[PDB]
Amino acid sequence: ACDYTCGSNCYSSSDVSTAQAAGYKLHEDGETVGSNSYPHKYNNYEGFDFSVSSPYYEWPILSSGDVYSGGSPGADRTVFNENNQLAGVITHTGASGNNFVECT
Numbered sequence: 331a332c333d334y335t336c337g338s339n340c341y342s343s344s345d346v347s348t349a350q351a352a353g354y355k356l357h358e359d360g361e362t363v364g365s366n367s368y369p370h371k372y373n374n375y376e377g378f379d380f381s382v383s384s385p386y387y388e389w390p391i392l393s394s395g396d397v398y399s400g401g402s403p404g405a406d407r408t409v410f411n412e413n414n415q416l417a418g419v420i421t422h423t424g425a426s427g428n429n430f431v432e433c434t
């Protein structure tokens with residue numbers, strides 16, 4: 331079973347932890363990758379009731395299992411905060427336009 335299901339993509343807790351660790355290290359070093367400059371601030375326009383505190387940052391999580399290093403980011407994202415606490419896993423899949431919905 332999937333710990334997180336983003337549309338058709340299946341992720342385990344270990345998948346999220348690996349992705350999060352990569353994104354947080356780049357955040358701490360002040361570096362970015364990709365055309366959309368990940369990781370970057372996640373403003374939470376959606377108004378998700380996250381249990382951890384702001385500020386939030388989004389970083390792509392890939393269905394291939396590899397860590398994001400540039401190129402197409404896909405539709406899925408891991409959202410973490412300044413303390414490297416996981417806020418949630420979201421996706422553009424099943425959401426209109428550039429909006430997000432939570433992965434179940």
Ligand SMILES: Nc1nc2c(ncn2[C@@H]2O[C@H](CO)[C@@H](O)[C@H]2OP(=O)(O)O)c(=O)[nH]1
Nearest residue numbers: 366370371372373374375376388428429430
């Ligand atoms: N939907 C959405 N997009 C956000 C949010 N915070 C930042 N963004 C960025 O705002 C722009 C319009 O949605 C996009 O560049 C999007 O970035 P990503 O596309 O990299 O997610 C947010 O809370 N919700």
Ligand SMILES: [Ca+2]
Nearest residue numbers: 341342345395
């Ligand atoms: Ca996996």
